[PDB]
Design an enzyme around this catalytic site. Structure first.
Site, PDB file in Angstrom:
ATOM      1  N   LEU A  48       0.797  -1.226   0.000  1.00  0.00           N
ATOM      2  CA  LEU A  48       0.000   0.000   0.000  1.00  0.00           C
ATOM      3  C   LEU A  48       0.834   1.283   0.000  1.00  0.00           C
ATOM      4  CD1 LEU A  48      -2.996  -0.929   2.320  1.00  0.00           C
ATOM      5  CD2 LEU A  48      -2.768  -1.079  -0.176  1.00  0.00           C
ATOM      6  N   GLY A  49       2.061   1.204   0.505  1.00  0.00           N
ATOM      7  CA  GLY A  49       2.940   2.360   0.493  1.00  0.00           C
ATOM      8  C   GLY A  49       4.304   2.114   1.107  1.00  0.00           C
ATOM      9  N   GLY A  55       8.021   4.370   2.770  1.00  0.00           N
ATOM     10  CA  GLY A  55       8.589   5.620   3.233  1.00  0.00           C
ATOM     11  C   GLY A  55      10.084   5.486   3.434  1.00  0.00           C
ATOM     12  N   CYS A  56      10.614   6.224   4.402  1.00  0.00           N
ATOM     13  CA  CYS A  56      12.030   6.149   4.733  1.00  0.00           C
ATOM     14  C   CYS A  56      12.233   5.491   6.096  1.00  0.00           C
ATOM     15  CB  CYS A  56      12.657   7.546   4.707  1.00  0.00           C
ATOM     16  SG  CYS A  56      11.653   8.850   5.477  1.00  0.00           S
ATOM     17  N   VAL A 108       3.862  -0.203   4.268  1.00  0.00           N
ATOM     18  CA  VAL A 108       2.538  -0.534   4.770  1.00  0.00           C
ATOM     19  C   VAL A 108       1.846  -1.491   3.818  1.00  0.00           C
ATOM     20  CG1 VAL A 108       0.265   0.322   5.319  1.00  0.00           C
ATOM     21  CG2 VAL A 108       2.290   1.666   5.927  1.00  0.00           C
ATOM     22  N   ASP A 114      -0.509  15.733  14.954  1.00  0.00           N
ATOM     23  CA  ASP A 114      -0.397  15.593  13.502  1.00  0.00           C
ATOM     24  C   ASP A 114      -1.780  15.395  12.865  1.00  0.00           C
ATOM     25  OD1 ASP A 114       1.043  15.670  11.133  1.00  0.00           O
ATOM     26  OD2 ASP A 114       1.660  13.574  11.225  1.00  0.00           O
TER      27      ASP A 114
END
Ligand SMILES: COc1cc(Nc2c(C#N)cnc3cc(OCCCN4CCN(C)CC4)c(OC)cc23)c(Cl)cc1Cl
Length: 266
Positions: A17-18, A20-21, A25, A130
């Site tokens: 699904l994704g 990052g660093c 996910v 956030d």
């Protein structure tokens, strides 16, 4: 280790699904029965301890309008496991094909749900830090849940969503979340548009400290823009509670805008 631990073997990743660093996910399944979302460690990319503080927070918080933690796996490879929100971020939803059909009744209800989860955050003496549409997850039947507790903390940074006293002086409280909630209301009423259109970060901070506030979104009733402006009061203590926000938004179409008619977009 505590009762949240599970055996890796009971987790099987399926669908990405994704990334990052710090990791990824995935969609996946749990004990061959239960649909889950799994968040992974790119093993050496960050300190797994601090990578799991997002789960330490999720263990303590439990509410129908907060995304539910299911399990953690504290030995490499490492995972966090939560319920699965079928429609992804609220931001993506609002910009997506469905977003254009949403009218004010649906958007206020969504905002009411988010306020409900934050009201819980409020009375638990936490701050999220956030809050914004990218960090609200959506399911079927337009269920909205607060997510991404990475920076969330027991009360002891993108200027567009962050209250000034917090961005400048590090003063994060439930009241700076209230500010962010005011920004999130403009995301809902614009179907997902970035705040302070055409202003860079510096111009936002300079203008906001100078008293500048975003005007009423097209077709947004003034009473809802008042609410935004109350969320954006210079003094944090004079900003409303999530308890007020939730009740105000739940009753909105009877108590405040009983004569509402749909228009072209809202
Ligand atoms: C597991 O651990 C964590 C996971 C997350 N993030 C997620 C949670 C949670 N929680 C729940 N559910 C998720 C669903 C997602 O996409 C759904 C499918 C997208 N489609 C759009 C197009 N249409 C037509 C089909 C659906 C998704 O995408 C990135 C991320 C999810 C966070 Cl923020 C923190 C922790 Cl610790």
């Amino acid at each position: 280790k505590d009762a949240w631990e599970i055996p890796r073997e009971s987790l099987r990743l399926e669908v990405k699904l994704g990334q990052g660093c710090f990791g990824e996910v995935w969609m996946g399944t749990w004990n061959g029965t239960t649909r889950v979302a799994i968040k992974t460690l790119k093993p050496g990319t960050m300190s797994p301890e601090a990578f799991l503080q997002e789960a330490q927070v999720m263990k303590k918080l439990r509410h129908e309008k907060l995304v539910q933690l299911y399990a953690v796996v504290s030995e490499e490879p490492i995972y966090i496991v939560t319920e699965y929100m079928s429609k992804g971020s609220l931001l993506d939803f609002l910009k997506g094909e469905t977003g254009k059909y949403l009218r004010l009744p649906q958007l206020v209800d969504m905002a009411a749900q988010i306020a409900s989860g934050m009201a819980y955050v409020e009375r638990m003496n936490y701050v999220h830090r956030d809050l914004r549409a990218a960090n609200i997850l959506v399911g079927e039947n337009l269920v909205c849940k607060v997510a991404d507790f990475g920076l969330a903390r027991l009360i002891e940074f993108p200027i567009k969503w962050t209250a000034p006293e917090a961005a400048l002086y590090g003063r994060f409280t439930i009241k700076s979340d209230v500010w962010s909630f005011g920004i999130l209301l403009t995301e809902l009423t614009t179907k997902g548009r970035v705040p302070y259109p055409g202003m860079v970060n510096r111009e936002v901070l300079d203008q906001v400290e100078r008293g500048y506030r975003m005007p009423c979104p097209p077709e947004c009733p003034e009473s809802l823009h008042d609410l935004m402006c109350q969320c954006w009061r210079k003094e944090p203590e004079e900003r409303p509670t999530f308890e007020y926000l939730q009740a105000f938004l739940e009753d909105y179409f009877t108590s405040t805008e009983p004569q509402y008619q749909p228009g072209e977009n809202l």
